């Protein structure tokens, strides 16, 4: 879950996310490294992996 | 580091080398997703991994072993735990996947597990289960399967459908536990008081979409009106409770009635029928004479001299034994078998001894020409292209009439241009198949001759 | 320029009215539409009227014919919102003080504010109770 600031119109006509995604670069790269490790360790466990159905 | 590697290896194992008490939720998910089964509903019981690993009664296991079913189908393996809990089940699957066995197994277990005092009935109160079929041929096939399954267990099966003489059907009904019939014939019998569902505790709806397309929906609604309403499960959360459902199933003859619906589609009429007959049912989704339409076909175009390298590369990627290799001549088949044996592969040439070895796992690759009976194979390799479409279709049919689609790999050369059009037509007619090389080939644009 | 041939010259231009049948379109038996799109010549050519307009790649090729597929009174609303409104507090902060989650009072007040905007004034959320009570007195 990510709770983001929102700046909307008073009629609901349009709703912006009033945020910029700042990251600490070492932490972001390390988090995606752990991600790489995990998504590789899982695919080798599920030999029949069911992709999401689009749309 | 080796001890750490071994521990790591040991945590996330495949279920092929794990025990059941250590089978975690994620391992179970990998299992069900492998068998192409998807379950809708809460508190879904763990699927049956194998007959030995299943919790079936010893008599039922012996009967199944005598029946020759080495491994339960994914539909059966996923529906048996649900059926054993006396909960309604919605089966998404086509004919030929073993749905009849998956529906009969819980009924046979419950019927055969009843006490002798409880199973004694002085008067005939009709069958304890009703199986509905939309077609006479399907009803006859289901009756044959039920006779094969329940005959050793002392269960009487009566088939009441069209295409049979009235006197024979009437005489059989007077004898008095399982009834399989069509909607119209069953409705006519019920309206005439020729059979009753006083002791009915299981309703089987096979091919509900087919029955709806046949216009039997009003007939099905009328038939359900004759069932006792007092045996219907409550329409609350308790209908899908695992402990409560298991306790109700263990109640024997006093257990609430269960309904199982198997169909390939869920139209609005099917939804209404499910809402009427079923209460908090669980949805189980899985996934005859045209193997090309239901068999995955792969085509690789190259020279004749490159066939061996491609076959070696494909084999190096791994496969599920047994496998079938197709050759045009016996000498070529023998040469290919010798080459495979030189590459450290257990290759069989092609009587019953080779098939027994392949079934037992000793032999992994079977090489034979277009010229018996063999089990379903995970992959069929067409090293030499068949000279006719019928031969290729028959070879592609070795992957199985139903169940896993399998893989059909055929090597196409310039000498097989006479069957390019037929191969392209077969491939384009297979929804389980993805080939621009053959479809756009100049030799596949017009019929030969 | 070459005299554009009349649609009577070909004759047999039956005034068909069916737009389509069996999915496929029904061409008009009259060349009035084709003549309008691009005029014929005196000898059956197709000088096409140059379509000088904006580009719309979806329209020029429609996927090969594609697939062919009650409000309360203003005084009543003001009185109700005033009843829902805490002393010396606007409508907006009134949403705030009740938004730290009476819930029913909260969505009632929010709805009132919403159709009050729908009336035609967007400064609803920037008015204290004194101003809107004065407005109610002025209209009353």
Swiss-Prot record, chain A:
Widely expressed. It is found in: Nucleus; Nucleus speckle. Plays a role in pre-mRNA splicing as core component of precatalytic, catalytic and postcatalytic spliceosomal complexes, both of the predominant U2-type spliceosome and the minor U12-type spliceosome. Functions as a scaffold that mediates the ordered assembly of spliceosomal proteins and snRNAs. Required for the assembly of the U4/U6-U5 tri-snRNP complex, a building block of the spliceosome. Functions as a scaffold that positions spliceosomal U2, U5 and U6 snRNAs at splice sites on pre-mRNA substrates, so that splicing can occur. Interacts with both the 5' and the 3' splice site. Part of the U5 snRNP complex. Component of the U4/U6-U5 tri-snRNP complex composed of the U4, U6 and U5 snRNAs and at least PRPF3, PRPF4, PRPF6, PRPF8, PRPF31, SNRNP200, TXNL4A, SNRNP40, DDX23, CD2BP2, PPIH, SNU13, EFTUD2, SART1 and USP39. Component of the U5.U4atac/U6atac snRNP complexes in U12-dependent spliceosomes. Within the minor spliceosome, which acts on U12-type introns, interacts with PPIL2 and RBM48. Core component of U2-type precatalytic, catalytic and postcatalytic spliceosomal complexes. Found in a mRNA splicing-dependent exon junction complex (EJC) with SRRM1. The MPN (JAB/Mov34) domain mediates interaction with TSSC4 and SNRNP200. Has structural similarity with deubiquitinating enzymes, but lacks the residues that would bind the catalytic metal ion. This is Pre-mRNA-processing-splicing factor 8. It comes from Homo sapiens.
Curated annotation (Swiss-Prot), chain B:
The lineage of its organism: Eukaryota, Metazoa, Chordata, Craniata, Vertebrata. Involved in pre-mRNA splicing and its phosphorylated form (by SRPK2) is required for spliceosomal B complex formation. Independently of its spliceosome formation function, required for the suppression of incorrect R-loops formed during transcription; R-loops are composed of a DNA:RNA hybrid and the associated non-template single-stranded DNA. Keywords: ATP-binding, Chromosome, Helicase, Hydrolase, Isopeptide bond, mRNA processing, mRNA splicing, Nucleotide-binding, Nucleus, Phosphoprotein, Spliceosome, Ubl conjugation. This is Probable ATP-dependent RNA helicase DDX23. In vitro phosphorylated by CLK1 and U1 snRNP-associated protein kinase. Phosphorylated by SRPK2 and this phosphorylation is required for its association with the tri-snRNP (U4/U6-U5 tri-small nuclear ribonucleoproteins) and subsequent spliceosomal B complex formation. May be phosphorylated by SRPK2 on Ser residues in the SR domain; the phosphorylation is required for the removal of inappropriate R-loops during transcription. Residues 307-442 form the Helicase C-terminal domain. The phosphorylated form (by SRPK2) is a component of the U4/U6-U5 tri-snRNP complex composed of the U4, U6 and U5 snRNAs and at least PRPF3, PRPF4, PRPF6, PRPF8, PRPF31, SNRNP200, TXNL4A, WDR57, SNRNP40, DDX23, CD2BP2, PPIH, SNU13, EFTUD2, SART1 and USP39. Identified in the spliceosome C complex. Interacts with ERBB4. Interacts with ERCC6. ATP binds at residues 93-100. GO terms for molecular function: ATP binding; ATP hydrolysis activity; mRNA binding; RNA binding; RNA helicase activity. It catalyses: ATP + H2O = ADP + phosphate + H(+). It comes from Homo sapiens. Its main location: nucleus. Its EC number is 3.6.4.13. The gene is DDX23.
Curated annotation (Swiss-Prot), chain C:
The modification Phosphoserine is found at residues 57, 102. It comes from the Eukaryota. It is found in: Cytoplasm; Nucleus. Involved in pre-mRNA splicing as component of the U5 snRNP complex that is involved in spliceosome assembly. Component of the U5 snRNP complex composed of the U5 snRNA and at least PRPF6, PRPF8, SNRNP200, EFTUD2, SNRNP40, DDX23, TXNL4A and CD2BP2. Interacts directly with TXNL4A and PRPF6. Interacts (via GYF domain) with CD2 (via Pro-rich sequence in the cytoplasmic domain). Interacts with PQBP1. This is CD2 antigen cytoplasmic tail-binding protein 2. The chain holds residues 62 to 233 of 341 of the full protein.
